[PDB]
């Protein structure tokens, strides 16, 4: 009845598509913005650096 | 056949152990010869003292 | 269910597991289909280098060719296990499981359950066991009919080898089996009957020797070759030097102690040789006419061989465990292992002892015994595969004829057993049986599967298999009403029926019993299995 | 005495035996056809230890190669070194032990052992001086381990005294993928100790280290390993086939290297793994040259025995011993055996074999795997099915408690 | 980077979803391996053998799953096999359903995985109560009912056709091992196999069965009253413990050293002949010389016999394990041996030891199996372990629970009725316990080919009104009461099934995350 | 259409194992395989026969005109040709004379059998034909004998 | 007992074809697998729903709580999901809201 | 005999060709017979491009799915 020896299961998303649940991703997104924020932290002020 | 090793407790055996051999081998060989033999076919390696 | 669990695996279920067991069965059946019967084809097996070994036995084909399928390895163990204890019926088990699966698979496609089908095979098997009691015939062993044993021997030998080898090798088995029967009626095959290889003139020159033949002879030239009356002596003591449990140096001091000590070392051997000389002094009378021979199970030192050569005592060393368990049966003496307690009663008797040599090897022959309780079968051959072909033929022939003397019954063959079960299962009233429901086809499936074996004999001869059973069916229709109990056969020479009672075709009792029992168990277990898978750590 | 038979069993056994004969035949001189093209008496006058002079001088080695996998025997035979061994000697029977002590052993001892006892008998009857038997088995496999155990036992019965030397190859924890290796290696030693008289431990894991460190072959092939095993074997056998008196003949080896009976296991040591006697001194005793996984410095040497070759005097070696004893005292033990002939290829080598308490590490390991990783009664049904019970396993672990104890008792 | 982790952390709800799907997948492999019409399973191990069976335990031994949640489900079969020996597939198939029914709630109604555990212990406490009430006692000495009790498990196997012989085979074996509380153990039950022969002539015989023959040919192959004496030691001179090294000075010493080797074996043999035994069974090997004078008294020598086979001989013949031969007396000699005889089979020789049959130590025995092939022997041997396992529970516990799913269905009805009166937050997991207990009859109807919709509806209608012993006939697929059907199973197997299945769910439900590839 | 099913149920045996039945002219090929080395033997039969350089694995060379000696070194693949090797080896061990007669006669019996099998004669009758010819052949060799030695030393 | 016979219908349809029929367990495989994407539209439902960022292969980023728009860009290999994908698109091209309710 | 003409050729004759013809027909039968009648099952022809299509007719199932076996090509035609 079957076409061959075995039949591997289908991944729902495409192979290599990154996905994650829970509170870890939104913390990573916030930490990503804070990482960009730290570059512009000492630039603020009339006594900042280029 | 089982661990043939010399044993000499005193100097009296040290003096006689070297010539004892000559004498013994010589005796066996003379025995062989009084029979008038002039050639012996050996089966394995022959020692120098017997030669 | 298995792919998310195991990242790598293979799984067949509910249609492929059934097709695999049937396809592998039909595949393995086609291999051994042509070998079954007297006019079957030979089969050689050359493995790595090109070692050649020739035989028609299905066990040799199965236990030499590596097989990957999971179904066939169970057929290999089933065909091997049935033959390893019985010695006959190897391909018959493969044909039954090879045919009963395909004959039931057509009804699995129709939608019948495997459980109730195998229930029909089991209750049908019990009917065959009840039929064996009525189908067999009693035979009294007190008559000692040698013609009856000759016909049984030709049943298996005609299947393996041709008529030229069968006629010369048949009485070799009959003379060996004629001595098996005794007052105790205890059968002994492995210790009594043996096989030995010897490259000689041809396979046709195989002869029977009533005594025990040995594969060794006298090492020294001066030792006697032929001895008229040789009284044997069994001694399991080893006469070369014995090393001695941690004992170490002969610490010698002067040079003389050395000679003395070597002489000493021997004294242990001469202490045992003196007991043999003391034994020879008791039997010293008629020394030129009579003789003496010593057979040792372990090696003898070459220094001590000159002692036996001077007294004209024949020396034989490094005998087998089995030969020491056979000298008492041939020569009639008793065994001994030590040299302290000796007597003239334990010494055997032999009427003729001679040696013959070819090339580097030398054989010792013993024969002309007074009352030999055992014997040997020295088979001659040309090539190594010729010995292997005679090995399987003699191994399967001795076991088949030996089982007839175990019991008081014998089953006629040539399809009489299978054709008789066909009419019995197809004509028996079902109300007497306890099976009901969808067990109608299970009786017909197993009853019809037995018919394929006797026509497989016809498939090797080339005749039409369906047409040569027409007169066989017509004979049994009139035989029941004619009031004459006769059993038909299948003669492949002319393509017509025959009678195995007068032709001499016979078969053992436990072969067909164990074959259907082993085949029904394997075929039933393969039908109920509905899933195959492989998993494990490696 | 004059001769010694050489049984080789198992896929590892056959490979190592083929390499060993390839070495031996070229050592004292015989083309693979058996003809002797050698120069002269020295190489011929002790050729009767392992070859049967046939009429016409077609020497043929006295070896019994056996395996339950037709294939390994076949490969070796169809290869070169296929004229020497007599065709009748090979004993090979289907199916495969299946890498199980229990199954392979019982089932085919039931058959292959009978055929082997038959071959060991008549072919050997042919000599006048059996001295013992040399078996090369793999401790961890199926056929080799099981059959070895059975045969050792069977032979010992048919040849009481005859010495019994083995060269079992211990398993590699890392490179032995099969999981049921320790659980076989344990059942094999159970019976190796009760019967054997002298045995040598070779570990594939150790062989890999020496192959990749000194030889520097990028990937060891079983071939390399086999060549190194072959070299040590050749040195120990020269200790035997060259006229000599220092450890002359097998039994002597045993007496010299075995302090007490239940300690058979030796640590081979060989150099110049790819020269002056002082140079080879360091190479023999370097902790990295051992072919045993356990470190010998942490352990304790009991009886040392060094087998030199090539051009070396009495005093070169004696002075060396005097110098060495002085510095490794914490680790008087010495036994020298100079030979005259030289390694094929190299001028001078020096094989090293010392009993050492350090083996108890290689057994504490194996016992740890056997017990801990089979407290869970894993992979045991394979063995209970063959017929042997679990009481036997309890006996097996018990007897290693014993081995370890012994080594600990001889105060490491 | 950071520590060896964080490849792909399956966290949150999807981690538990994979475990319920993985736990359900284990039961789906052996879904068809339940009931009287169960299908067989041939598994291929990587070494080279083959395992033909339908028992869930033997199937799950050979399989290998690279998932940590499914391996905990794999170990439950060892809990059932090494506790009773029957109902291993029942344990695996029930738990799958319990984890599956509880899942809806975990996934959707958000009940935390601890509140489900508290609901299950009260269901476990009530499950033992109704299983205790539904079970009826039975007399242990009734051989007529004991044969029908033993063959309840055999009916789900291949040898139901030979059930008339297997119950007699198993009943005689269990009473032999049974000690007069009533503790028995299967380590002395010898599982020796003989390939070939018919099952009808196969029978149990009191005593042992060796694979070896006598050494010397003159040994008596037929003894009327054997007198067995067990030996542990080598009967041959042995090297000895300390560093020895005899040094020989005179020529009359080496022949003396070889002569005392003959006299020491004479001394140990002569003291064995003080009691004059007929059969001497040595553990280790034997010499060719000692055997020779063992012969000069009338003994019989054998090859090396492993320890196991001697501890059974010690209980059969009544002898003791003896190593020191100097302390050999007449009291420790085995006696009351029935018969000695050696049959010829092409595989190997076989020495038979029969008992006179006429408290003391428990007697051992060996069960003869005459199958068709090698796999048929291993198939039948596991049936005896499953059949003889049933005989232990009735002796340890005289209670007897109804079979055919009637016991588990009784748990389903009472938990369903009591779930209404259990108003609160525990009501939803408590009611879901009945949904899985009604599946173990559903699997029987699916294998029988009937429609489980109307059968289970007809079952619950008659279970409350008709009786507590109602069940499904697996062969015919109709509702037939267990009283008239005449098939019963022990109550101990029902306890281990409910306990092990619920206790497995409490472990796996607490799993939050899965992190693979940390270290060895 | 693009590819066959490549012999299904072939996993019963290993991939390296091959069967060779009588059909497909394979018995004719086995006769042709004998014909390869049989023609080598023709040039080596008699007083004008030519020797053969049979170098071997080692390099050890032997130049020869004997059928039994030359066939020892050649590694043969065909099993039916190895029957002639061991048949001539039996001739050399027992009598030590007439090995070329064994090779050239038994090869030609397979040559004329190529015509008989092609005509349609069953293999069972072919063995019965040569056996009945063999009994008459060995009988007449004793009849047409002339001369005798009658003296061990002359 | 090492290599299987390899399903002798392998002479039929090529290795790329995979059959996932029933009885084998297709329904159990499907209803479940799609529970992952069922939670996607469930979490994005309601006024307090969470929008989902979908980055296509070209790189055009879209962030939406609108389910439809989502499944248009998701390259889904599972065929049984795709029945739900374009069935939701029918609601988009026609009714225009509820894309998330129908899924 | 065919290998002497073309070494790269193959041939199954008189027992292997018959099993191929019957097994390919039974293999084609076992897959495609389920669509017969009103209670038949639906097939999803999912090609590499992701095109989904439901049908029960044997013509379009065999047209999209290329046939490797030579026997079933004759039945598809
Ligand atoms: N040192 C060494 N070990 C080897 C070599 N080849 C194989 N082995 C060892 O062989 C072991 C497994 O092989 P065996 O147990 O001999 O295999 P076998 O059981 O004889 O093979 P079967 O009888 O077919 O099962 C492994 O532990 C390897 O370490 C080699 O060339 N050198
Ligand atoms: N000359 C013959 N005439 C008729 N039947 C024969 C003859 N030789 C063998 N048979 C039948 O062939 C069958 C198989 O014989 P045998 O080779 O002994 O067993 P197996 O083929 O199982 O090894 C037997 O049932 C026997 O009746
Ligand atoms: N003849 C039968 N009819 C209906 N149900 C049965 C029958 N025999 C056994 N069962 C059911 O099958 C379950 C398992 O029984 P059994 O097969 O003996 O154990 P295992 O699952 O270990 O093989 C039992 O719980 C019982 O309810
Ligand atoms: N000079 C000769 N004249 C005629 N015939 C010869 C002569 N020499 C040999 N023959 C024949 O050639 C045949 C060759 O026999 P052959 O098989 O080569 O003998 P061998 O067994 O020694 O090789 C002989 O039988 C002989 O009759
Ligand atoms: N302030 C509010 N109070 C109560 N319900 C609300 C409120 N705002 C939105 N909702 C509910 O949220 C739901 C969101 O439905 P939605 O999925 O957007 O509809 P559709 O599926 O038709 O696009 C609506 O059915 C609506 O009733
Ligand atoms: Mg037969
Ligand atoms: Mg059960």
XYZ file of N, CA and C in Angstrom, chain C residues 1-2 4-7 13 21 70-71 73-74 77-78 81 84-85 113-115 118-119 122 125-126 129 187-191 236 241-242 244-251 257 260-261 264-265 267-268 272 298 321-322 324-325 328 334-338 341 513-514 517-518 520-522 524-526 528-538, chain E residues 21-22 25-26 28-29 32 36-46 48-50 52 62-67 70 157-158 161-162 195-200 213-218 221 237-239 244-252 254-255 257-258 261-262 288-289 291-292 296 303 344-347 349 370 372-376 379 447:
498
model
N 4.367 6.975 13.842
C 4.623 6.779 15.265
C 6.096 6.507 15.564
N 6.811 5.910 14.605
C 8.217 5.557 14.775
C 9.183 6.618 14.261
N 8.958 10.132 14.476
C 9.219 11.159 15.479
C 9.991 10.614 16.676
N 9.853 9.322 16.982
C 10.613 8.721 18.072
C 12.067 8.498 17.668
N 12.296 7.658 16.637
C 13.626 7.344 16.128
C 13.950 8.266 14.956
N 15.077 8.999 14.920
C 15.328 9.850 13.741
C 15.576 9.074 12.456
N 3.998 -2.185 7.416
C 2.855 -2.543 8.247
C 1.592 -2.726 7.411
N 6.629 -11.506 3.619
C 6.710 -12.892 4.068
C 6.333 -13.862 2.954
N 14.444 -10.993 6.783
C 14.106 -11.505 8.121
C 13.226 -12.742 8.107
N 12.525 -13.020 7.004
C 11.684 -14.210 6.937
C 12.523 -15.458 6.697
N 15.589 -16.239 7.374
C 16.446 -16.723 8.453
C 15.662 -17.638 9.388
N 14.352 -17.413 9.528
C 13.510 -18.335 10.280
C 13.259 -19.621 9.507
N 16.604 -21.517 10.035
C 16.658 -22.218 11.313
C 15.667 -23.371 11.361
N 14.507 -23.218 10.719
C 13.512 -24.285 10.721
C 13.965 -25.453 9.857
N 17.099 -26.910 11.842
C 16.787 -27.586 13.096
C 16.058 -28.905 12.880
N 18.853 -31.268 11.630
C 19.976 -31.514 12.529
C 19.727 -32.682 13.476
N 18.468 -32.938 13.843
C 18.112 -34.051 14.719
C 17.564 -35.248 13.951
N -9.613 -13.378 8.310
C -8.679 -12.971 9.350
C -7.510 -13.960 9.413
N -6.297 -13.519 9.788
C -5.212 -14.506 9.939
C -5.382 -15.419 11.140
N -6.082 -14.968 12.184
C -6.222 -15.771 13.397
C -7.042 -17.029 13.135
N -5.144 -19.626 10.812
C -4.192 -20.451 11.545
C -4.870 -21.378 12.543
N -6.063 -21.024 13.024
C -6.834 -21.954 13.840
C -7.246 -23.175 13.025
N -4.157 -25.573 12.746
C -3.873 -26.333 13.958
C -4.836 -27.500 14.132
N -4.016 -30.003 11.661
C -2.803 -30.741 11.994
C -3.107 -31.902 12.932
N -4.033 -31.704 13.876
C -4.421 -32.787 14.774
C -5.089 -33.928 14.019
N -2.243 -36.079 12.629
C -1.648 -36.948 13.639
C -2.517 -38.172 13.893
N 20.005 -47.880 20.018
C 20.581 -47.322 18.803
C 21.722 -46.382 19.165
N 22.801 -46.445 18.385
C 23.991 -45.624 18.595
C 24.585 -45.316 17.227
N 24.435 -44.068 16.778
C 24.845 -43.636 15.445
C 26.177 -42.895 15.445
N 26.340 -41.911 16.333
C 27.516 -41.050 16.284
C 28.780 -41.792 16.711
N 28.700 -42.587 17.780
C 29.868 -43.332 18.236
C 30.191 -44.508 17.324
N 45.689 -43.800 28.127
C 45.526 -42.353 28.018
C 46.659 -41.584 28.704
N 57.913 -36.243 27.840
C 58.185 -35.662 29.126
C 57.019 -34.930 29.705
N 56.934 -34.856 31.016
C 55.912 -34.056 31.637
C 56.610 -32.875 32.225
N 55.970 -30.674 34.672
C 56.082 -30.647 36.152
C 55.770 -29.431 37.069
N 54.583 -28.827 37.001
C 54.151 -27.803 37.972
C 55.123 -26.894 38.773
N 55.798 -25.950 38.112
C 56.699 -24.920 38.717
C 58.059 -25.431 38.974
N 58.214 -26.756 38.938
C 59.553 -27.338 39.078
C 60.501 -26.588 38.157
N 61.669 -26.220 38.662
C 62.562 -25.412 37.847
C 63.887 -26.067 37.522
N 64.981 -25.435 37.919
C 66.291 -25.942 37.558
C 66.877 -27.200 38.128
N 67.541 -27.983 37.285
C 68.256 -29.142 37.786
C 69.593 -28.551 38.153
N 69.652 -27.765 39.222
C 70.889 -27.080 39.580
C 72.058 -28.041 39.621
N 76.958 -34.162 37.201
C 75.675 -34.214 37.731
C 74.823 -34.003 36.539
N 74.061 -37.197 34.916
C 73.235 -37.986 35.776
C 71.827 -37.511 35.724
N 71.613 -36.213 35.772
C 70.295 -35.647 35.756
C 69.515 -35.856 34.502
N 68.233 -39.037 34.663
C 67.170 -39.031 35.628
C 65.911 -38.618 35.019
N 65.982 -37.640 34.180
C 64.808 -37.131 33.583
C 64.156 -38.231 32.868
N 64.038 -41.865 33.391
C 63.576 -42.729 34.473
C 62.063 -42.678 34.648
N 61.448 -41.511 34.443
C 59.994 -41.426 34.518
C 59.342 -42.140 33.341
N 57.246 -46.349 33.176
C 56.013 -46.748 32.510
C 56.247 -47.769 31.406
N 47.374 -39.251 23.619
C 48.267 -38.098 23.625
C 49.590 -38.491 22.964
N 39.263 -38.566 20.679
C 38.408 -38.958 21.794
C 37.418 -40.035 21.372
N 36.921 -39.959 20.136
C 35.915 -40.905 19.674
C 36.503 -42.288 19.426
N 39.009 -43.759 21.033
C 39.168 -44.442 22.312
C 37.849 -45.000 22.826
N 36.728 -44.365 22.486
C 35.398 -44.849 22.830
C 34.865 -45.901 21.855
N 36.952 -50.560 22.346
C 36.321 -51.609 23.138
C 35.230 -52.322 22.352
N 39.058 -53.953 27.078
C 38.665 -52.929 28.037
C 39.730 -51.844 28.078
N 39.307 -50.643 28.459
C 40.178 -49.479 28.461
C 40.969 -49.397 29.760
N 42.100 -48.657 29.600
C 43.046 -48.474 30.705
C 43.720 -47.123 30.473
N 44.166 -46.440 31.519
C 44.732 -45.112 31.404
C 46.030 -45.027 32.145
N 46.166 -45.787 33.211
C 47.358 -45.782 34.020
C 48.119 -47.054 33.810
N 47.989 -51.003 37.402
C 47.178 -52.219 37.426
C 46.911 -52.651 35.990
N 6.275 -36.166 10.389
C 5.628 -35.658 11.594
C 6.248 -34.336 12.027
N 7.573 -34.306 12.178
C 8.248 -33.085 12.605
C 8.234 -32.012 11.521
N 4.801 -30.244 11.714
C 4.736 -29.551 12.998
C 5.630 -28.317 12.996
N 6.846 -28.447 12.468
C 7.730 -27.297 12.376
C 7.281 -26.304 11.321
N 4.069 -25.845 10.207
C 2.830 -25.193 10.618
C 3.092 -24.127 11.675
N 4.062 -24.362 12.559
C 4.394 -23.363 13.559
C 5.034 -22.129 12.955
N 5.931 -22.323 11.986
C 6.613 -21.195 11.361
C 5.654 -20.433 10.454
N 2.378 -20.299 10.608
C 1.352 -19.617 11.388
C 1.896 -18.335 12.006
N 3.103 -18.391 12.570
C 3.708 -17.215 13.179
C 4.015 -16.117 12.169
N 4.336 -16.475 10.925
C 4.586 -15.468 9.900
C 3.298 -14.817 9.412
N 0.448 -14.256 11.327
C -0.057 -13.356 12.357
C 0.747 -12.069 12.475
N 2.003 -12.055 12.035
C 2.824 -10.855 12.081
C 2.355 -9.887 11.005
N 2.012 -8.666 11.425
C 1.493 -7.621 10.549
C 2.338 -6.354 10.560
N 3.583 -6.414 11.030
C 4.433 -5.233 11.068
C 5.889 -5.659 11.208
N 6.756 -5.014 10.426
C 8.198 -5.221 10.459
C 8.886 -3.897 10.761
N 9.950 -3.955 11.558
C 10.684 -2.754 11.926
C 12.079 -3.146 12.390
N 12.995 -2.178 12.321
C 14.382 -2.339 12.747
C 14.736 -1.175 13.658
N 15.283 -1.483 14.830
C 15.678 -0.456 15.781
C 16.653 -1.049 16.787
N 17.658 -0.262 17.139
C 18.642 -0.684 18.114
C 19.874 0.191 18.046
N 20.732 0.009 19.047
C 21.957 0.783 19.198
C 23.096 0.063 18.493
N 23.863 0.806 17.702
C 24.997 0.244 16.978
C 25.979 1.340 16.583
N 2.453 13.487 22.185
C 2.487 12.853 20.871
C 3.510 11.726 20.838
N 4.626 11.889 21.556
C 5.622 10.827 21.631
C 5.144 9.671 22.497
N 2.658 7.747 20.555
C 3.279 6.982 19.480
C 3.789 5.625 19.947
N 4.185 5.500 21.215
C 4.673 4.217 21.715
C 3.532 3.209 21.782
N 0.819 3.262 19.889
C 0.332 2.964 18.548
C 1.118 1.846 17.874
N 2.368 1.615 18.281
C 3.167 0.550 17.680
C 2.585 -0.814 18.037
N -2.225 -3.145 17.990
C -2.771 -4.409 17.510
C -2.266 -5.627 18.281
N -7.306 -11.510 22.138
C -7.053 -12.880 21.665
C -6.683 -12.962 20.196
N -7.124 -12.009 19.374
C -6.825 -11.963 17.943
C -5.661 -11.022 17.652
N -4.686 -10.971 18.555
C -3.558 -10.065 18.415
C -2.574 -10.576 17.371
N -1.959 -9.634 16.661
C -0.986 -9.928 15.621
C 0.420 -9.994 16.213
N 1.284 -10.757 15.548
C 2.664 -10.933 15.975
C 3.539 -9.806 15.427
N 4.769 -9.736 15.943
C 5.721 -8.682 15.600
C 7.110 -9.290 15.489
N 7.713 -9.178 14.302
C 9.090 -9.592 14.054
C 9.978 -8.353 14.012
N 10.850 -8.217 15.013
C 11.799 -7.116 15.115
C 13.192 -7.603 14.741
N 13.928 -6.743 14.034
C 15.269 -7.039 13.533
C 16.283 -6.279 14.378
N 17.038 -7.009 15.203
C 18.119 -6.416 15.972
C 19.349 -6.240 15.078
N 20.255 -5.305 15.401
C 21.392 -5.068 14.496
C 22.493 -6.115 14.592
N 22.163 -9.546 14.423
C 21.887 -10.578 13.431
C 20.761 -11.532 13.783
N 20.225 -11.514 15.002
C 19.155 -12.409 15.395
C 17.794 -11.913 14.957
N 16.762 -12.463 15.592
C 15.386 -12.084 15.305
C 14.527 -12.438 16.509
N 10.600 -12.880 17.461
C 9.226 -13.085 17.006
C 8.348 -13.201 18.242
N 13.866 -4.553 22.204
C 14.689 -4.447 21.007
C 14.610 -3.079 20.342
N 13.494 -2.365 20.486
C 13.361 -1.060 19.853
C 14.262 -0.053 20.564
N 14.647 0.990 19.827
C 15.490 2.064 20.341
C 14.944 3.380 19.815
N 14.583 4.277 20.736
C 14.017 5.585 20.422
C 14.946 6.654 20.979
N 15.318 7.604 20.124
C 16.186 8.719 20.506
C 15.345 9.914 20.952
N 14.651 9.720 22.076
C 13.806 10.745 22.675
C 13.701 10.477 24.176
N 9.925 9.349 25.638
C 9.491 8.015 25.242
C 10.266 6.909 25.945
N -2.078 -16.052 23.089
C -0.797 -16.466 22.529
C -1.042 -17.536 21.464
N 0.050 -18.082 20.926
C -0.047 -19.061 19.850
C -0.441 -20.451 20.346
N -4.084 -23.645 21.313
C -4.471 -24.966 20.832
C -3.919 -26.082 21.708
N -2.718 -25.902 22.266
C -2.123 -26.832 23.218
C -2.364 -26.403 24.663
N 15.635 -28.209 19.936
C 14.968 -27.914 18.659
C 14.379 -29.167 18.029
N 13.139 -29.042 17.554
C 12.447 -30.133 16.898
C 11.610 -30.959 17.856
N 10.765 -31.794 17.263
C 9.846 -32.658 17.976
C 8.446 -32.071 18.008
N 7.524 -32.862 18.558
C 6.109 -32.517 18.632
C 5.777 -32.040 20.038
N 4.813 -31.121 20.126
C 4.463 -30.515 21.407
C 3.714 -31.503 22.301
N 3.051 -32.508 21.718
C 2.240 -33.424 22.515
C 3.103 -34.296 23.421
N 27.873 -35.746 28.152
C 27.898 -37.188 28.349
C 29.019 -37.561 29.318
N 29.131 -38.855 29.614
C 30.217 -39.349 30.451
C 31.533 -39.282 29.680
N 32.638 -39.323 30.427
C 33.963 -39.167 29.832
C 34.482 -40.506 29.320
N 34.535 -41.535 30.211
C 35.090 -42.838 29.879
C 34.006 -43.738 29.284
N 34.310 -44.660 28.357
C 33.216 -45.442 27.757
C 32.630 -46.486 28.692
N 33.410 -46.997 29.642
C 32.968 -48.059 30.538
C 32.014 -47.585 31.636
N 25.737 -46.533 31.800
C 24.738 -45.671 31.182
C 23.337 -45.844 31.765
N 45.937 -31.971 40.136
C 46.949 -31.240 40.865
C 47.038 -29.924 40.256
N 47.222 -28.908 41.068
C 47.211 -27.585 40.529
C 48.457 -26.886 40.925
N 48.797 -25.816 40.237
C 50.031 -25.117 40.520
C 50.107 -24.617 41.932
N 56.778 -20.652 43.999
C 57.289 -21.966 44.451
C 58.727 -22.439 44.152
N 59.102 -22.574 42.886
C 60.476 -22.964 42.503
C 61.233 -24.115 43.190
N 60.822 -25.372 43.001
C 61.596 -26.495 43.503
C 62.934 -26.569 42.849
N 63.982 -26.810 43.617
C 65.312 -26.877 43.092
C 65.729 -28.291 43.245
N 66.147 -28.953 42.184
C 66.420 -30.368 42.245
C 67.885 -30.636 42.241
N 68.356 -31.376 43.224
C 69.785 -31.660 43.337
C 70.149 -33.083 42.952
N 69.362 -34.068 43.381
C 69.599 -35.477 43.103
C 68.738 -35.939 41.932
N 69.155 -37.048 41.318
C 68.417 -37.606 40.190
C 67.117 -38.282 40.608
N 66.999 -38.713 41.865
C 65.804 -39.389 42.356
C 64.710 -38.429 42.821
N 63.184 -35.810 40.546
C 62.247 -35.460 39.484
C 61.210 -36.554 39.269
N 61.632 -37.820 39.281
C 60.671 -38.913 39.236
C 59.810 -38.957 40.491
N 58.887 -36.152 42.061
C 57.963 -35.037 41.867
C 56.821 -35.451 40.946
N 57.126 -36.225 39.904
C 56.090 -36.738 39.017
C 55.308 -37.892 39.630
N 52.574 -36.409 42.038
C 51.442 -35.984 41.222
C 50.444 -37.112 41.001
N 50.917 -38.360 40.945
C 50.028 -39.509 40.824
C 49.434 -39.905 42.173
N 42.635 -36.991 33.196
C 42.471 -38.304 32.606
C 42.839 -39.383 33.608
N 43.766 -39.112 34.545
C 44.173 -40.087 35.618
C 43.339 -40.327 36.846
N 40.165 -39.832 36.927
C 38.956 -40.461 36.412
C 39.165 -41.965 36.345
N 40.402 -42.365 36.056
C 40.724 -43.784 35.933
C 40.475 -44.585 37.204
N 37.984 -47.251 39.267
C 38.172 -48.444 40.117
C 37.312 -48.622 41.405
N 32.114 -33.851 32.577
C 32.947 -32.708 32.229
C 32.664 -31.571 33.216
N 20.164 -40.322 22.576
C 20.967 -39.924 21.420
C 20.170 -38.923 20.595
N 20.665 -37.687 20.539
C 20.130 -36.632 19.685
C 21.304 -36.037 18.918
N 21.081 -35.741 17.635
C 22.154 -35.322 16.748
C 22.832 -34.027 17.144
N 22.121 -33.132 17.832
C 22.714 -31.880 18.288
C 23.826 -32.147 19.297
N 24.664 -34.752 23.183
C 24.192 -35.763 24.114
C 23.401 -35.099 25.237
N 9.642 -29.125 23.032
C 9.864 -29.754 21.730
C 9.080 -28.951 20.697
N 9.114 -26.481 16.879
C 9.334 -26.699 15.461
C 10.678 -26.187 14.989
N 11.109 -25.055 15.539
C 12.365 -24.419 15.160
C 12.912 -23.684 16.379
N 13.933 -22.854 16.158
C 14.539 -22.107 17.254
C 13.628 -20.982 17.734
N 13.011 -20.247 16.806
C 12.128 -19.153 17.200
C 10.864 -19.664 17.883
N 10.416 -20.873 17.540
C 9.236 -21.441 18.188
C 9.546 -21.775 19.641
N 9.579 -18.485 21.464
C 8.197 -18.030 21.563
C 7.461 -18.776 22.668
N -9.766 -4.885 17.323
C -9.088 -6.080 16.839
C -10.065 -7.170 16.425
